[PDB]
Amino acid sequence: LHEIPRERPATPLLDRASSPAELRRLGEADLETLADELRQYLLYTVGQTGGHFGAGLGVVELTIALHYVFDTPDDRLVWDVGHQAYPHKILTERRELMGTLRQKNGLAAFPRRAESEYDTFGVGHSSTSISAALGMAIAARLQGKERKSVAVIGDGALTAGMAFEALNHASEVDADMLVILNDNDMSISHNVGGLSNYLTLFEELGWNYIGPIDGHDLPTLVATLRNMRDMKGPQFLHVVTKKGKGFAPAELDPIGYHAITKLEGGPKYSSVFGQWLCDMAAQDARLLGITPAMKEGSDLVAFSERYPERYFDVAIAEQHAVTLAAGMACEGMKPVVAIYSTFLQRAYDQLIHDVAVQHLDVLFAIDRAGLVGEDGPTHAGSFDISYLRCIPGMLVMTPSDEDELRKLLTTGYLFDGPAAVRYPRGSGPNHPIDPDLQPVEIGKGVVRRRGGRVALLVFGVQLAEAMKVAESLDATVVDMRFVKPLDEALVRELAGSHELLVTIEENAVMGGAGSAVGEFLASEGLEVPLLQLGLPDYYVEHAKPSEMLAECGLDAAGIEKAVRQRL
Amino acid sequence: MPKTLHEIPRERPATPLLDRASSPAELRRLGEADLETLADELRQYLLYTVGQTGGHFGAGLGVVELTIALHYVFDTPDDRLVWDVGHQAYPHKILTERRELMGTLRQKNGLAAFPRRAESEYDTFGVGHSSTSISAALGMAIAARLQGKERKSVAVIGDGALTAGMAFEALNHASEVDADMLVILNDNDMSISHNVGGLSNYLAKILFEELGWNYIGPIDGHDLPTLVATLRNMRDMKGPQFLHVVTKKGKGFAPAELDPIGYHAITKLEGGPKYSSVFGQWLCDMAAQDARLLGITPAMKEGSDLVAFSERYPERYFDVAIAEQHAVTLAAGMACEGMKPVVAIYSTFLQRAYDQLIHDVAVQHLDVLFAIDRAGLVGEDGPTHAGSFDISYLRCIPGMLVMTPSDEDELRKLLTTGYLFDGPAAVRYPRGSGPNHPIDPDLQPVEIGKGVVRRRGGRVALLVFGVQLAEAMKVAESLDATVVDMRFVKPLDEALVRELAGSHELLVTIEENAVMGGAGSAVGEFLASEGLEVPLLQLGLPDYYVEHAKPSEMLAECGLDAAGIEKAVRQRL
Amino acid sequence: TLHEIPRERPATPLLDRASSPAELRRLGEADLETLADELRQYLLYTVGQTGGHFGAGLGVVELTIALHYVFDTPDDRLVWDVGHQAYPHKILTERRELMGTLRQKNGLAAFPRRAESEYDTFGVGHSSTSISAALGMAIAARLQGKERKSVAVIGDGALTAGMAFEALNHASEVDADMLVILNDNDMSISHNVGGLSNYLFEELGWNYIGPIDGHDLPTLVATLRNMRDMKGPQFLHVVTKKGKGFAPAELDPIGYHAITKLETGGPKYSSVFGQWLCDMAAQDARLLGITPAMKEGSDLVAFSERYPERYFDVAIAEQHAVTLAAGMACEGMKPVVAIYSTFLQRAYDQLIHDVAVQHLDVLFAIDRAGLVGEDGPTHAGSFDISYLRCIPGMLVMTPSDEDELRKLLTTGYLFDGPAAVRYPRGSGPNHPIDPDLQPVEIGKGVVRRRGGRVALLVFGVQLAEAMKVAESLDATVVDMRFVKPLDEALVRELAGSHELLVTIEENAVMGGAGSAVGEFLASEGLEVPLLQLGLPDYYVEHAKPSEMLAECGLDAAGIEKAVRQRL
Ligand SMILES: CC(=O)c1sc(CCOP(=O)(O)OP(=O)(O)O)c(C)[n+]1Cc1cnc(C)nc1N
Ligand SMILES: CC(=O)c1sc(CCOP(=O)(O)OP(=O)(O)O)c(C)[n+]1Cc1cnc(C)nc1N
Ligand SMILES: CC(=O)c1sc(CCOP(=O)(O)OP(=O)(O)O)c(C)[n+]1Cc1cnc(C)nc1N
Ligand SMILES: [Ca+2]
Ligand SMILES: [Ca+2]
Ligand SMILES: [Ca+2]
Ligand SMILES: [Ca+2]
Ligand SMILES: [Ca+2]
Ligand SMILES: [Ca+2]
Ligand SMILES: [Ca+2]
Ligand SMILES: [Ca+2]
Ligand SMILES: [Mg+2]
Ligand SMILES: [Mg+2]
Ligand SMILES: [Mg+2]
Numbered sequence A: 001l002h003e004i005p006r007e008r009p010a011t012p013l014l015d016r017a018s019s020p021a022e023l024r025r026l027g028e029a030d031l032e033t034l035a036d037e038l039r040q041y042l043l044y045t046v047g048q049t050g051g052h053f054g055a056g057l058g059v060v061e062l063t064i065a066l067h068y069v070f071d072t073p074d075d076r077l078v079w080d081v082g083h084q085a086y087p088h089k090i091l092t093e094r095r096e097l098m099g100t101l102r103q104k105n106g107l108a109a110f111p112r113r114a115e116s117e118y119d120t121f122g123v124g125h126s127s128t129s130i131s132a133a134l135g136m137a138i139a140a141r142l143q144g145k146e147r148k149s150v151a152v153i154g155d156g157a158l159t160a161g162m163a164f165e166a167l168n169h170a171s172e173v174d175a176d177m178l179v180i181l182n183d184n185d186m187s188i189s190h191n192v193g194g195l196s197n198y199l200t201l202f203e204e205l206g207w208n209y210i211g212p213i214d215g216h217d218l219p220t221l222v223a224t225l226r227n228m229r230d231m232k233g234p235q236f237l238h239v240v241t242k243k244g245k246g247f248a249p250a251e252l253d254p255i256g257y258h259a260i261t262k263l264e265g266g267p268k269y270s271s272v273f274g275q276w277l278c279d280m281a282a283q284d285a286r287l288l289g290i291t292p293a294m295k296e297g298s299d300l301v302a303f304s305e306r307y308p309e310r311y312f313d314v315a316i317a318e319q320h321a322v323t324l325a326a327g328m329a330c331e332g333m334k335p336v337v338a339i340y341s342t343f344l345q346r347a348y349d350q351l352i353h354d355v356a357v358q359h360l361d362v363l364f365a366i367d368r369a370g371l372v373g374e375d376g377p378t379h380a381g382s383f384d385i386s387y388l389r390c391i392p393g394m395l396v397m398t399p400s401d402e403d404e405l406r407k408l409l410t411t412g413y414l415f416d417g418p419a420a421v422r423y424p425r426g427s428g429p430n431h432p433i434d435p436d437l438q439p440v441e442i443g444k445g446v447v448r449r450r451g452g453r454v455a456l457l458v459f460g461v462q463l464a465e466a467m468k469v470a471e472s473l474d475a476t477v478v479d480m481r482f483v484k485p486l487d488e489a490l491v492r493e494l495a496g497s498h499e500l501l502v503t504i505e506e507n508a509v510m511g512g513a514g515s516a517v518g519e520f521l522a523s524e525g526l527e528v529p530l531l532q533l534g535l536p537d538y539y540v541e542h543a544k545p546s547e548m549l550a551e552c553g554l555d556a557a558g559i560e561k562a563v564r565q566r567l
Numbered sequence B: 001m002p003k004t005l006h007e008i009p010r011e012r013p014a015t016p017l018l019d020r021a022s023s024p025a026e027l028r029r030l031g032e033a034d035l036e037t038l039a040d041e042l043r044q045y046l047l048y049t050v051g052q053t054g055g056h057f058g059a060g061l062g063v064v065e066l067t068i069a070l071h072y073v074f075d076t077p078d079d080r081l082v083w084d085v086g087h088q089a090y091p092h093k094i095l096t097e098r099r100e101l102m103g104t105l106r107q108k109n110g111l112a113a114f115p116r117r118a119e120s121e122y123d124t125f126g127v128g129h130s131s132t133s134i135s136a137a138l139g140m141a142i143a144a145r146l147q148g149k150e151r152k153s154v155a156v157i158g159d160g161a162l163t164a165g166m167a168f169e170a171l172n173h174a175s176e177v178d179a180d181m182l183v184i185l186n187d188n189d190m191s192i193s194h195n196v197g198g199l200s201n202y203l204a205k206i207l208f209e210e211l212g213w214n215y216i217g218p219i220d221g222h223d224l225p226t227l228v229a230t231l232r233n234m235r236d237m238k239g240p241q242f243l244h245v246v247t248k249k250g251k252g253f254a255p256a257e258l259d260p261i262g263y264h265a266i267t268k269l270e271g272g273p274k275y276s277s278v279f280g281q282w283l284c285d286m287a288a289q290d291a292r293l294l295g296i297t298p299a300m301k302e303g304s305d306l307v308a309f310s311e312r313y314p315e316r317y318f319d320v321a322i323a324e325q326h327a328v329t330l331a332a333g334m335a336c337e338g339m340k341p342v343v344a345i346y347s348t349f350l351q352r353a354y355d356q357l358i359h360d361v362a363v364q365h366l367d368v369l370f371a372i373d374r375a376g377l378v379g380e381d382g383p384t385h386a387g388s389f390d391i392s393y394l395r396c397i398p399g400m401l402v403m404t405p406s407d408e409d410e411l412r413k414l415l416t417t418g419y420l421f422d423g424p425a426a427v428r429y430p431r432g433s434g435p436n437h438p439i440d441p442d443l444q445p446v447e448i449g450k451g452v453v454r455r456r457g458g459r460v461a462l463l464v465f466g467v468q469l470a471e472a473m474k475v476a477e478s479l480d481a482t483v484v485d486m487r488f489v490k491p492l493d494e495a496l497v498r499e500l501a502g503s504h505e506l507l508v509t510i511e512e513n514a515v516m517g518g519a520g521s522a523v524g525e526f527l528a529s530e531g532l533e534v535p536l537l538q539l540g541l542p543d544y545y546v547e548h549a550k551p552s553e554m555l556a557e558c559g560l561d562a563a564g565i566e567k568a569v570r571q572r573l
Numbered sequence C: 001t002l003h004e005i006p007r008e009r010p011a012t013p014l015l016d017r018a019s020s021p022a023e024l025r026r027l028g029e030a031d032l033e034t035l036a037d038e039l040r041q042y043l044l045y046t047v048g049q050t051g052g053h054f055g056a057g058l059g060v061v062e063l064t065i066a067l068h069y070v071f072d073t074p075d076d077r078l079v080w081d082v083g084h085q086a087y088p089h090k091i092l093t094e095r096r097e098l099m100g101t102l103r104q105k106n107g108l109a110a111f112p113r114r115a116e117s118e119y120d121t122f123g124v125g126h127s128s129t130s131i132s133a134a135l136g137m138a139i140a141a142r143l144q145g146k147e148r149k150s151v152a153v154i155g156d157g158a159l160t161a162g163m164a165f166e167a168l169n170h171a172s173e174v175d176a177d178m179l180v181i182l183n184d185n186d187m188s189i190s191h192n193v194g195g196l197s198n199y200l201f202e203e204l205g206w207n208y209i210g211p212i213d214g215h216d217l218p219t220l221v222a223t224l225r226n227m228r229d230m231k232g233p234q235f236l237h238v239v240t241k242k243g244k245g246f247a248p249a250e251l252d253p254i255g256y257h258a259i260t261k262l263e264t265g266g267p268k269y270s271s272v273f274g275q276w277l278c279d280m281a282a283q284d285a286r287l288l289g290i291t292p293a294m295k296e297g298s299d300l301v302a303f304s305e306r307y308p309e310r311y312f313d314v315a316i317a318e319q320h321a322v323t324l325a326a327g328m329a330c331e332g333m334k335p336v337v338a339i340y341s342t343f344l345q346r347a348y349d350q351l352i353h354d355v356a357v358q359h360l361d362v363l364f365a366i367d368r369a370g371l372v373g374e375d376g377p378t379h380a381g382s383f384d385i386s387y388l389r390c391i392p393g394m395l396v397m398t399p400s401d402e403d404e405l406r407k408l409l410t411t412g413y414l415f416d417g418p419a420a421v422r423y424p425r426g427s428g429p430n431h432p433i434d435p436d437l438q439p440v441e442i443g444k445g446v447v448r449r450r451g452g453r454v455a456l457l458v459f460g461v462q463l464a465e466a467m468k469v470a471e472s473l474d475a476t477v478v479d480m481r482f483v484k485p486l487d488e489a490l491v492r493e494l495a496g497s498h499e500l501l502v503t504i505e506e507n508a509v510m511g512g513a514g515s516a517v518g519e520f521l522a523s524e525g526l527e528v529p530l531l532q533l534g535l536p537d538y539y540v541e542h543a544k545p546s547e548m549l550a551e552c553g554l555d556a557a558g559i560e561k562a563v564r565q566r567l
């Protein structure tokens, strides 16, 4: 195909395959026509809603073959990451719901147990499929059940250490499971790493290796899968697909068609970071840039092109990224680790043990801080203030706009020790950006408005919304800048001169920046009323970022109501 | 009422609105009611700037409105616009960030004669030879569709360029692939001469609809409201679209409207015969002596100068339109019946009839003469028109007699020689005039395969193949070299080369053709086959495309003036 | 669900058994969800045959079924607000097989209409009258002791109108037994704006129930049954999706508000106005554009995109639109109120008292002047010349084509005071439009044709037809341009040089432009015969615009006949 259909395509066979049981009643000679019809519907519906695109096209045939051969949902199918699982959802009683995909109260971005019995494991983060499938296989055997266990994992997801740990353990217990490597020689960017060069190691680890086979030859897929379904012990099938298969524009540009917006401001914070990284690297030859397979997302694109000898994509290996930075810092170089808040969860131990405990000079640029929108709770950056500020030695910063991000990145970089700067997805208020590269004083907030009875202590990008509230209430507003060290002097002054302190952050209230203020007030015996605004103690369902923020009360309307209700 | 301008402005005309349309993006910010004023100003500037630099003239005036409408309606440069030939693309250049550079047009290091990809992002395809626009735009449209770029592809082709076979091939293929593209036939019932052919006859009556094309028109190519409205409607249509537009060559300038042939090109405002004129006189003279002579040109009566011949012998003159391939095979058929066809064709255009020359003429050893004008460097038209290869690509073809006259008298003599020769013959000569030597008025051949020693000397021998002879005689004076007017590349004067190789210390070959595969290499091949061990210095055109400039400037760059030849021989010795 | 509009009458055996509410009420609750599907099939089909309003009716298919199933119609009073959503209502009230005549001459009307059926309690078209009318019926029923129910279905858009606020407050005061059902789909024609939409009763004395799913028939029937017998003012909040059941309409609720029947001219006058508004705004920062919820119809689309800070949608609030403009003009701004002639009569007092009495600089761009076609007499712009020309200070203008509209908008805009420019729906003769922005002399007509004997004084778009008649009669023809101030010098000249003066206008003859000419002739004692052509003193039944103009004698044939008979 060359264009995305704008009207629903005619899919008479797909319409008869609304669930796997229905699909399995069709004949083999029908599956290649079904594949065509599924590809057309997929193009149509993702064109309608936006969403992940290329990876799903690559597994259209694999998905058909899997549900045709295996007795799903009794047999357990685990998709790694799940961004390639739209065909899976189309064939599991959700085709006519795809119009709600990634919309409030609609289908989720990834497989989700609560959404369908056909989703065995909620995914989003990568490389969990083998571990989860092995647990189900072990349990099923102990229960005396005869079900199969299958994990589909891409070549990029396979670069993570936890996939290696799983492959190793499965051999040890001699589990009856099938791992299918979906190898398209791609991640988001090109798959760079020693494992992609290799793509036997799988044989030597205790797995029976079959392949590589054509992942788009349905006859070979069904016959091969049929053979291995009833084979015993750890089985490993190497499949080769093409990302974007069947849509030429995506085959020709797999990066740009990894995801698309539905068919028909200022710079993104990631772009501000990318410019800062290039500018600082131009002035300091010691700066090194690290990403775990997210060059495009964190926006190290220009940096990678201009400073290729100082740019490092470690594949989907968050752990190694951080300890690698620690080693670089030991030799006097200046590593910057670009990592999403949600993915830094996977390198927590390396940050604590290898960086913080040693007080090594490593800067963490934490993107996608806060609510991330349609990708949903698996990717929310809800916790990084809480899980970092309890770590001794960490400098924790929360910029309120573009200029502040540039300044605090510079501040964290020039600081000799571990520093973190957190910022959200998307763009900001579009304030002027100072082109200079100058730091700000550590541990000092900035008073943005002087008012009367309420003091709003803002940690991060809710400042503009708090300013609206403060103009309505004639309140004091502080751009806190730093969670740790806290501007204790300023907090103390405001606690004496105001009747109510209000803290605002795009992080879990539990353990968050507002609780840092609470800890200070308590330790000094200051008993001013304190209202903590932030993310609630549940997982916020996917929606537009504005709808999720409104749900959490972090727009002007929600902030003002909370304040006035307290007063 | 439209006004007819009658004089070329000598001073920069006042064009305040054109100055606000320096690029298509700026033009598209203007209002549709301003475009007809813009068209008048663009015409005034066009007349002024070509009067300053010389260049192509009438064709550009005919597409002023069409060019304005195209950049107004289409999203250039993202939408792809392909101009056929490109001689009519001065308005295009003026609207695409090059207005104030038009003063450098066709000068060394200035704007080139035609659209050029390296010159501007608004130039999608380098043109010069005709009839490539449809094929090129089709390829662009096919690639854009596979890439998902939703680009528009537009080819503007004149009624003359549409007479070429390759345009017919592209129209038929575009229908097969159901390409989303627009072909605009710029019909003005003119080529350089009057457009004479069966296609021209059919276009006057009005299928492209029988082919897989949606035909719209004809429409007035000088009615900007209609052009804009029509292009707007067709821009968003799918599949192969064909818009028939009617224009007037020279529109707006009364002298060019009256005399479209004479105003196809002009020299900027304020010697012996041209070689083309020497050929034209020979053609008439031989035709008066031989009823068998037939004269053929692919739409270049004026350039090759068959003018007097076409008037004196209309029944024996054949303009085949821009159809180089058919011209050659037609000559072959004529020769089969005992007639004596002469194919007048520029060196750069004969490469489009190469297969007809080999397969239909040379394989059959048929009696056809090729009068190859514009051999060598052609000057301002630049590399797309360079006659750089005809010695190389003809000399490897068995049966070919290949000749290189050195002056006016030699051209007449070698035309007679190749004409009378019972088989295929080629005589190459350059644009412009020569040394103005006396021309023997008789019509007699010379001995085939024999050069003429024009200076007896020693030590160094200059083996000259063509018009650099006069420069080589200058160099020979200081060196006391011998100089041979070789006359024939094929058959080579082997007996003389063998003598000189034995009596001299250095052989120097000179030719206005690529050194690679050229006439010097024929000398080289002969020396090798006989085991002759004499140093050989091969002078000629280099292995790159020579940028446009005055002929003298291009020859100097390549080292084919007296100074360059002397330096080369001196540095070898 | 459905993706294409049926081209052949779909089989609807159960719908065909519910031809009236009494027949509907004999079916069982379990049959209603199938009935709803059959109704949508028929609705999509019939509107595809005739055209008309589309999305809103699809949104109330379930609500309409539930109301007639639970309530004892027609004895119980059901009032539909606006009525564009009442096609299902008509289909269920003995007009299903007459829907083929919908919006055609002598066929069913565009909206509910008392004369059309005993099931139509109140003729609607203009919005927000349902609560007032239902309250009136309830007060009367109570005094008569009838114990009948009174129900008003009102959309969230219609609820933004002041008169609905007035009805809600009075109903509370009198403690009326009535049910107000809010049909909340978060849509007007465009997206619903205003602080009410942002909020979406108890304090106003109403018992509020909901929100409930307006497409869940079990919940609807059960809820309505419960509230039917509750006493006092009852308020039910229902949530529906505009275009429910037809994917293209659900995706594009604005474009599917109304459709043309399934199967080259100049710009619509509304488009000429929209282009003028943009052109003038680019030359004058003072211009502000106001619309009461009719961005699409009046065509402020491009203006609202290019000048969003100077565009104001006040919801369905004609009154406030005008007084707001008066306020902006007090500060030196140049407001333009875009408003249909038929809707301007709801802001008559604000035009008189707040604008004209103060002689404030406000331009009224009066669209839909004259006959409007299939929407019928509730929407006719029949009276604006009559009700505006009697108001001192008003500049009243009647452009005859596209170029004249642009010129007279500029004239009224630059005029320092109140100005009105009226023009019809649809397109015009397609004459060239001068791109410049210059006014014309106030109070002067232009002679378009010099003739003799009879002079045609044309105010507005009948000029083209008058020119046709003038061809056969060799008549003088004047494009008057201005009703007020009148070109008295020109009328004086014509009265002394012709035997008959003929006035032509697309406005009521009574009080119209022709009567301004007669008033001048009388005051000067000029006794030239006067023939006044225009709209008759009755409400013209819906039909094609060309058929309604022919009925009124305002086409060339009708004008010619009337002139010849007078002569
Ligand atoms: C969007 C998202 O979450 C994806 S998809 C993807 C690479 C996918 O490569 P794979 O070869 O496994 O699949 P393919 O697309 O079919 O080639 C990454 C790194 N991410 C972000 C990411 C980063 N880091 C971790 C631990 N998990 C995830 N999901
Ligand atoms: C100078 C040059 O290269 C031109 S312009 C022209 C005819 C132009 O006719 P057209 O109708 O297509 O355009 P118009 O001028 O607007 O009428 C010819 C034959 N030539 C010489 C020529 C000969 N043969 C070929 C293959 N290409 C070219 N360019
Ligand atoms: C009939 C007409 O011209 C319609 S329909 C409509 C939208 C009403 O939205 P609502 O939420 O009440 O209904 P919905 O379609 O179900 O969402 C408007 C503003 N209008 C124009 C209009 C303007 N102003 C007034 C006083 N009355 C009307 N009818
Ligand atoms: Ca540092
Ligand atoms: Ca945010
Ligand atoms: Ca204050
Ligand atoms: Ca000339
Ligand atoms: Ca011969
Ligand atoms: Ca002689
Ligand atoms: Ca010379
Ligand atoms: Ca004007
Ligand atoms: Mg991959
Ligand atoms: Mg031509
Ligand atoms: Mg609504």
Ligand code: NA
Binding pocket: A255, A256, A257, A258, A259, A260, A261
């Ligand atoms: Na993309």
Ligand code: NA
Binding pocket: C254, C255, C256, C257, C258, C259, C260
């Ligand atoms: Na519509």
